[PDB]
Amino acid sequence: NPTVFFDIAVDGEPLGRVSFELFADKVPKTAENFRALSTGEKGFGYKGSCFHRIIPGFMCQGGDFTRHNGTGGKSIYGEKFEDENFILKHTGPGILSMANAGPNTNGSQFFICTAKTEWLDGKHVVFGKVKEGMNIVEAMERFGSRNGKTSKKITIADCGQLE
Amino acid sequence: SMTEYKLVVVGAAGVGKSALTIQLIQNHFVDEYDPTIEDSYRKQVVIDGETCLLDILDTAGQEEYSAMRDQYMRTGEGFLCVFAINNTKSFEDIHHYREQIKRVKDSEDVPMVLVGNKCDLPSRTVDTKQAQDLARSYGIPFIETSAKTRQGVDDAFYTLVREIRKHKEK
Ligand SMILES: CCn1c(-c2cc(N3CCN(C4CC4)CC3)cnc2[C@H](C)OC)c2c3cc(ccc31)-c1csc(n1)C[C@H](NC(=O)[C@H]1[C@@H]3COC[C@@H]31)C(=O)N1CCC[C@H](N1)C(=O)OCC(C)(C)C2
Ligand SMILES: Nc1nc2c(ncn2[C@@H]2O[C@H](COP(=O)(O)OP(=O)(O)NP(=O)(O)O)[C@@H](O)[C@H]2O)c(=O)[nH]1
Ligand SMILES: [Mg+2]
């Protein structure tokens, strides 16, 4: 399974690096999308994009690098792609899973759980987890709110794949 | 000072609750889909020669969280019940939204307006008469709107204010 990282910034000041294991063993198409978006190798991807929705107690959501407003993003296969499988569940903090607007609408938006979110099982494709830096994701919750609007600009200042 | 009116916009996901609210508050039309978690807005308006303050709660249509609607239905004074004229399921959902409000309020007499949105679109599956007949059977107003063209936007929110005022002063 490949590993990728995000270097997170808060209003442009470094906060730290989060790394993620992508479950290519179980969800190869979804893992490869997130890997390639993290390296930017298709000419677009997560670098410079923000976490637009942070709700303490639940999750940090990001990945809209096309519109930067929570409505956009696109995959390496087209604007949307199908739900690959729902084998893996939202078992606890650190789970990395795809956001969507209903069935078969995966793009680039994703979320990182800060709690177990069992009611999303079967609805969102889980495809990775935080490896190092979970405390950075916890620290991002300091900037969230009840409806998810953030109080500082939380960005992926750099990202890529770890050897 | 001026009177504040607590309005709550409900209805199935995608019917245009947020597009209506943003048209009212900000005079622009959101073409993109930004499904709501929950948003609150304030606007002062002149209705029948008097200025008042609207406090508008724009709610999620997400069906998965239907059991968490009780708290906002308790505090809201009047409800805009929105469906889309090209989505028969969203019209069928109206009954269920209204019944939930009545249950939470424990009242058959709750200020409400039925709103048939997306009236600019040619795909109409719910007829005006069918919606008019339904509103008449509920004893509430019915207004067709388009958040895209602004047709009926002000009228739907102002009519709801008038329904709340009648109820407060009764
Ligand atoms: C009812 C209020 N409320 C809650 C919620 C619920 C609860 N519970 C639920 C569970 N109970 C336990 C069983 C006992 C406890 C009480 C408590 N408090 C709240 C909040 C804080 O009250 C304000 C939520 C929630 C979520 C939605 C709407 C309203 C919601 C909603 C709208 S759209 C969506 N969900 C999916 C969204 N889609 C898009 O963003 C599409 C955009 C367009 O196309 C690409 C892009 C998406 O993929 N994700 C990625 C996944 C997490 C998800 N967002 C999200 O944000 O969930 C927020 C939250 C808080 C987890 C759930
Ligand atoms: N043609 C047309 N499109 C509309 C109209 N109102 C909303 N839309 C479109 O329909 C989609 C859903 O609108 P939106 O306001 O987000 O609906 P909502 O009821 O708030 N959805 P949610 O419950 O998920 O928050 C968007 O693409 C929006 O542009 C309307 O009157 N006419
Ligand atoms: Mg909305």
Numbering used by the authors:
A (entry chain D): 3 to 165
B (entry chain A): 0 to 169
Authors' description from the paper:
The binary CYPA–compound complex then binds to active RAS (with dissociation constant Kd2) to form a tri-complex structure in which CYPA sterically occludes RAS–effector interactions.
These differences indicate that KRAS genotype could affect the cellular response to direct RAS inhibition, and that the cellular response to RMC-7977 inhibition is not equivalent to that of MEK inhibition. Preclinically, RMC-7977 demonstrated potent activity against RAS-addicted tumours carrying various RAS genotypes, particularly against cancer models with KRAS codon 12 mutations (KRASG12X).
